[PDB]
Design an enzyme around this catalytic site. Structure first.
Site, PDB file in Angstrom:
ATOM      1  CE1 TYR A 182      32.172 -14.835 -56.140  1.00  9.84           C
ATOM      2  CE2 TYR A 182      31.671 -14.374 -53.856  1.00  9.84           C
ATOM      3  CZ  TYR A 182      31.274 -14.795 -55.097  1.00  9.84           C
ATOM      4  OH  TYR A 182      29.981 -15.185 -55.289  1.00  9.84           O
ATOM      5  NE  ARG A 230      29.419 -13.370 -44.940  1.00  8.53           N
ATOM      6  CZ  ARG A 230      28.149 -13.500 -45.306  1.00  8.53           C
ATOM      7  NH1 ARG A 230      27.722 -13.017 -46.453  1.00  8.53           N
ATOM      8  NH2 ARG A 230      27.298 -14.153 -44.516  1.00  8.53           N
TER       9      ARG A 230
HETATM   10  C1  LIG Z   1      20.386 -13.169 -53.090  1.00  2.00           C
HETATM   11  C2  LIG Z   1      21.647 -13.534 -52.337  1.00  2.00           C
HETATM   12  C3  LIG Z   1      22.792 -12.839 -52.694  1.00  2.00           C
HETATM   13  C4  LIG Z   1      23.951 -13.027 -51.958  1.00  2.00           C
HETATM   14  C5  LIG Z   1      23.981 -13.903 -50.904  1.00  2.00           C
HETATM   15  C6  LIG Z   1      22.887 -14.724 -50.657  1.00  2.00           C
HETATM   16  C7  LIG Z   1      21.716 -14.478 -51.327  1.00  2.00           C
HETATM   17  C8  LIG Z   1      20.451 -15.222 -50.952  1.00  2.00           C
HETATM   18  N1  LIG Z   1      25.110 -13.898 -49.981  1.00  2.00           N
HETATM   19  C9  LIG Z   1      25.122 -14.775 -48.818  1.00  2.00           C
HETATM   20  C10 LIG Z   1      24.260 -14.133 -47.722  1.00  2.00           C
HETATM   21  O1  LIG Z   1      24.909 -12.959 -47.276  1.00  2.00           O
HETATM   22  C11 LIG Z   1      24.010 -15.039 -46.505  1.00  2.00           C
HETATM   23  O2  LIG Z   1      25.234 -15.443 -45.967  1.00  2.00           O
HETATM   24  C12 LIG Z   1      23.195 -16.261 -46.909  1.00  2.00           C
HETATM   25  O3  LIG Z   1      22.055 -15.856 -47.626  1.00  2.00           O
HETATM   26  C13 LIG Z   1      22.755 -17.116 -45.717  1.00  2.00           C
HETATM   27  O4  LIG Z   1      21.944 -16.421 -44.820  1.00  2.00           O
HETATM   28  P1  LIG Z   1      20.349 -16.723 -44.837  1.00  2.00           P
HETATM   29  O5  LIG Z   1      20.110 -18.196 -44.560  1.00  2.00           O
HETATM   30  O6  LIG Z   1      19.835 -16.361 -46.209  1.00  2.00           O
HETATM   31  O7  LIG Z   1      19.781 -15.825 -43.773  1.00  2.00           O
HETATM   32  C14 LIG Z   1      26.209 -12.963 -50.170  1.00  2.00           C
HETATM   33  N2  LIG Z   1      27.279 -13.058 -49.420  1.00  2.00           N
HETATM   34  C15 LIG Z   1      28.195 -12.077 -49.478  1.00  2.00           C
HETATM   35  O8  LIG Z   1      29.157 -12.133 -48.758  1.00  2.00           O
HETATM   36  N3  LIG Z   1      27.993 -11.047 -50.348  1.00  2.00           N
HETATM   37  C16 LIG Z   1      26.968 -10.957 -51.159  1.00  2.00           C
HETATM   38  O9  LIG Z   1      26.813  -9.999 -51.902  1.00  2.00           O
HETATM   39  C17 LIG Z   1      26.169 -12.076 -51.210  1.00  2.00           C
HETATM   40  N4  LIG Z   1      25.075 -12.126 -52.134  1.00  2.00           N
HETATM   41  N1  LIG Z   2      28.508 -12.269 -53.492  1.00  2.00           N
HETATM   42  C1  LIG Z   2      28.548 -13.496 -52.773  1.00  2.00           C
HETATM   43  O1  LIG Z   2      29.284 -13.647 -51.810  1.00  2.00           O
HETATM   44  C2  LIG Z   2      27.539 -14.556 -53.190  1.00  2.00           C
HETATM   45  C3  LIG Z   2      27.401 -15.607 -52.382  1.00  2.00           C
HETATM   46  N2  LIG Z   2      26.719 -16.747 -52.821  1.00  2.00           N
HETATM   47  C4  LIG Z   2      26.795 -17.945 -51.976  1.00  2.00           C
HETATM   48  C5  LIG Z   2      25.412 -18.544 -51.670  1.00  2.00           C
HETATM   49  C6  LIG Z   2      25.201 -20.045 -51.686  1.00  2.00           C
HETATM   50  C7  LIG Z   2      23.970 -20.556 -51.409  1.00  2.00           C
HETATM   51  C8  LIG Z   2      22.812 -19.630 -51.090  1.00  2.00           C
HETATM   52  C9  LIG Z   2      23.008 -18.291 -51.073  1.00  2.00           C
HETATM   53  C10 LIG Z   2      24.383 -17.730 -51.386  1.00  2.00           C
HETATM   54  C11 LIG Z   2      26.055 -16.744 -54.091  1.00  2.00           C
HETATM   55  C12 LIG Z   2      25.573 -15.375 -54.499  1.00  2.00           C
HETATM   56  C13 LIG Z   2      26.687 -14.335 -54.429  1.00  2.00           C
END
Ligand SMILES: Cc1cc2c(cc1C)N(C[C@H](O)[C@H](O)[C@H](O)COP(=O)(O)O)c1[nH]c(=O)[nH]c(=O)c1N2
Ligand SMILES: NC(=O)C1=CN(Cc2ccccc2)CCC1
Ligand SMILES: Cc1cc2c(cc1C)N(C[C@H](O)[C@H](O)[C@H](O)COP(=O)(O)O)c1[nH]c(=O)[nH]c(=O)c1N2
Ligand SMILES: NC(=O)C1=CN(Cc2ccccc2)CCC1
Ligand SMILES: [Ca+2]
Lengths: 359, 359
Positions: A182, A230
């Site tokens: 982003y 992050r």
């Molecule tokens: C539904 C959904 C939505 C998002 C995400 C993932 C998922 C599943 N992730 C990434 C998340 O914070 C995390 O790093 C990953 O899901 C990996 O961790 P887990 O293996 O799911 O515990 C994410 N990362 C972030 O920095 N901001 C966010 O808003 C999002 N949004």
């Molecule tokens: N807002 C964010 O930082 C997001 C992170 N994503 C990476 C991702 C890749 C694979 C599985 C879960 C998330 C996708 C959803 C929005």
């Protein structure tokens, strides 16, 4: 159990080392959160996690990923978060929020509605901004417009205003979203930043947007509440050695700039990568950042297995373990982990109306 | 999977055979529910269960079990349930409510606060009512006031009023609480009912309070919404063969009186019993009621193991499987069950913002 030791950072004490990382819900309308989020967040907080970081919340309308993304770009948007903060706190968890700008990955469909850039003839779309007029590619082909200096000033101020609003809504923990391709991540990466002004073309210049934004936020964010970010510290793009070295140096400058903790992630800046997904695969990377930059860290990706979370803490790879998708599956995952790890009185990870009966 | 087959009863269709049975939360104040309940119920409904029966809700103040019990004895109390009803519906589940009167087991402490009758000194207590002036004993020593005919008329009318309020709150499913040793169960049992008037001393007379209350409620409860009851069909008191025979006959009379489904349970009328708690132990009892009274049934106690639930349905022991404590542990238990049973697209048991990421 290391997972269930408290953690104190500045004036905030987390009841355990389980963090729920930000997870976009794509359920807001015009940035306004609603009953979806209220219940979603409250239920997870009651599940036992020590810290709940609310999903990526756009600092400006064009910085949403999708038409369903939360925003905090007005006082009305901030007011919508007050009851979420209150419910998280009432559950005994600490409320945090990730403030964000999706940059060139903005103006996309919700993941279950194509997950791709909105087309030019779909009136829901918008022009995206980025350091340089270069598309991500693949399912995000839209070319962003390259930011002007006034755009840069405006976006920095939007991060400041978002931090101010988060503060005043009662959040006790803030996370700047400089990861996942982003806007912030894309200023740091040479893949996406081809600028020749003060904000591109050298390490100092690529770091500038991120460090100036951190400094501007630091002015308004209380010194006694954790200020975090992050950041994607490598891409798995065949440039990992050099990229990790630069990322760790930037993390050192974040520390010099008052950052309290770094959430260590992957860049996702371009699609041409070979990311070695696997259980706890970030653990050794987070450890290196933690040790070399001398900053507390969290990371994610696979720690829904309670033993992996415990192992990472015991190995001093992480200070907090972020557990995302396992909490979507089971909002009470922290209780599950307490049981799995043989914590005494594990059911009292939950509030009494549950704990009493589950003992 | 039998567990994930829809079920239709009167005008109501449930998306699967998973019912969440009533579970007291002990978190209300003067009968009024609050944010505890709002999040609790909404989160479980989003978890995928087809039916969610709200906890024992008192038809009158003295009919609460405890000072934390929910009530529906005024229109303000009923209005408080509207957002619970609506949140359950928004999640695609069907909202039900169990309306109740605790009888001689009323005026008790919360379960984690002693679980016993409130002491005389303690100003939170109240006088209890019952068919006869006889205490339960053990941890519930308080002697109730024996009800007069005027009292009986008043309580029946309170049930009617409660049903009207439940209707107007938007509940689509009602359950009369004639089980677990509270007022209705205690009129049926010869242990607690020693009356010599029209409401005791014969099978017809002991049945009378229950049949009259059902008939009275039936006058205001919509004909096109399931009208159900919970009833303890044996006590495990050494009188099980005779008691079960009488209970099944009363079930036939309930059917003749318009009951749509019977939730089969244990009496808990007295403490001097030997209940053989075990996984699915009620399955054969419920089957016998279903078969001999020719009425749809549900039951509970152990079906948190998805295979046990599936087996009970395939054996035609139950029409709905009630799963209680597993939903306190994991509000998304229905999703866990879908996965465990290998349902196709099991993650879409949950709403999209979870389902997309869990498939
Ligand atoms: C539904 C959904 C939505 C998002 C995400 C993932 C998922 C599943 N992730 C990434 C998340 O914070 C995390 O790093 C990953 O899901 C990996 O961790 P887990 O293996 O799911 O515990 C994410 N990362 C972030 O920095 N901001 C966010 O808003 C999002 N949004
Ligand atoms: N807002 C964010 O930082 C997001 C992170 N994503 C990476 C991702 C890749 C694979 C599985 C879960 C998330 C996708 C959803 C929005
Ligand atoms: C916290 C709690 C609260 C209550 C209950 C139980 C528990 C655990 N149960 C009994 C419940 O509906 C169910 O029959 C049992 O929990 C057994 O099913 P499980 O083994 O838990 O699935 C219950 N029964 C009832 O008829 N009305 C109620 O309000 C209550 N309250
Ligand atoms: N309102 C009711 O019908 C209740 C039923 N209980 C029986 C029970 C016994 C053992 C385990 C769980 C529930 C106790 C809690 C309230
Ligand atoms: Ca464009």
């Amino acid at each position: 159990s290391a997972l269930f030791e408290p953690y104190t950072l500045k004036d905030v004490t987390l009841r355990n080392r389980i963090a729920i990382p930000p997870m976009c819900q794509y359920m807001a309308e015009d940035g306004l959160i609603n009953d979806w989020h209220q219940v979603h967040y409250a239920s997870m907080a009651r599940g036992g996690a020590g810290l709940l970081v609310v999903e990526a919340t756009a600092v400006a309308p064009e910085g949403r990923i999708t038409p369903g993304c939360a925003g905090i770009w007005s006082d009305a948007h901030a007011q919508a978060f007050v009851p979420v903060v209150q419910a998280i706190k009432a559950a005994g968890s600490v409320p945090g929020i990730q403030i964000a700008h999706a940059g060139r990955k903005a103006s996309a469909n919700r993941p279950w509605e194509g997950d791709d850039h909105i087309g030019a003839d779909d009136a829901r779309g918008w022009e995206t901004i980025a350091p340089s007029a270069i598309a991500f590619g693949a399912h995000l082909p839209n070319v962003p417009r390259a930011m002007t200096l006034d755009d840069i000033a405006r976006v920095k101020q939007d991060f400041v205003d978002a931090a101010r609003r988060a503060r005043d809504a009662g959040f006790e923990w803030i996370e700047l979203h400089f990861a996942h391709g982003y806007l912030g991540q894309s200023f740091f990466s040479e893949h996406s930043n081809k600028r020749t002004d003060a904000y591109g073309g050298s390490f100092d210049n690529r770091s500038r947007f991120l460090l100036e934004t951190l400094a501007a936020v630091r002015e308004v964010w209380p010194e006694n509440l954790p200020l975090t970010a992050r950041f994607g510290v490598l891409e798995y793009d065949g440039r990992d050695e050099q990229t990790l070295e630069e990322s760790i140096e930037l993390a050192r400058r974040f520390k010099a700039g008052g950052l309290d903790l770094l959430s260590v992630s992957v860049g996702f800046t371009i699609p041409e990568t070979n990311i070695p997904w696997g259980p706890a695969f970030m653990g050794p990377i987070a450890e290196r950042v933690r040790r070399e930059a001398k900053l507390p860290v969290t990371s994610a990706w696979g720690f829904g297995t309670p033993q992996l979370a415990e192992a990472a803490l015991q190995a001093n790879q992480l200070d907090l373990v972020s557990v995302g998708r396992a909490h979507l599956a089971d909002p009470h995952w922290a209780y599950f982990a307490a049981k799995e790890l043989g914590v005494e009185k594990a059911s009292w990870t939950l509030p009494a109306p549950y704990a009493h009966w589950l003992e």
